[model samples]
Target: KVFGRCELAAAMKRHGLDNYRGYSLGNWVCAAKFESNFNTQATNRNTDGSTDYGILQINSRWWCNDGRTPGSRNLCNIPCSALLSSDITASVNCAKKIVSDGNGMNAWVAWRNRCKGTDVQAWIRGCRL
Candidate 1:
């Protein structure tokens, strides 16, 4: 949970308020919450003995291809392990990938705008745009 907060914070700091103006962080947090409930050690078993963990829901087989252990000591630790190791670029790229996966960021923005249906006070208070 803490790592999720930190990563989300780092993302916010790097992207700024305007970048998240249309409830971006809200959407990200909601996704992470739904995926792992912000649990860093959260894992799901794959048919081939792989695991997926962390807020961003990274897959170890695809990213690290290692054994499935517990805690942050495993080969595919969340946050720093996944985002600070050799796969750092990929982690950020994943963010871009999420944005451009199919409908793109603009679609997400449109969804957020319609879902929330209003400019959140947090965005007005904190964001640049």
Candidate 2:
């Protein structure tokens, strides 16, 4: 695990991620909660044979290379294993790239399914960041 919601928000803000790429910090925080509960080592295999990695649950199909996957876009140009670590700089950078690529936060299924139109402010409650 990396950070709790409060610390995560603070860190994101400190890292210049608050209001990043036109999305509020709340949206990012909420997405993280549902994606991996802030766990850096989190990984889940999809029925389509793709795997999700890190706190944001980035997919190997288009974002990162898991080596086993074929035809990976690997747009981030980093190995999928880079995302599953305590240091989230690579993951954050990849996430920013994903957001810029046109899906916004909607690229993450958990964001659409759980965070969208929801009271996500709770993710940063009492953090004061």
Which residue ranges in model 2 land beyond 4 Å of their true spot?
none
What lDDT does model 1 reach? 0.46
lDDT of 2 by residue, 1-129 (tens): 678788889877776677888778889989988899989899999888899999899999999999978777899999999999788888899998999987788998889999999887777778877
1-129 per-residue lDDT for model 1 (tens digits): 344444554554465422443435555544445555555455666566655645455656544444443332333233434543322343444445455445544333333454344443332243332
Q: Looking at model 1, report the run of 10 residues with the lowest lDDT sum.
A: 69-78
RMSD of each: 8.0, 1.2
Model 2 steric clash pairs: none
Q: After aligning candidate 1 to the native by TM-score, how far in Å is the CA of 117 from where it should be?
A: 9.6
Q: What is residue 31's positional error in candidate 1, in angstroms?
A: 0.6
lDDT of 2 at 112: 97
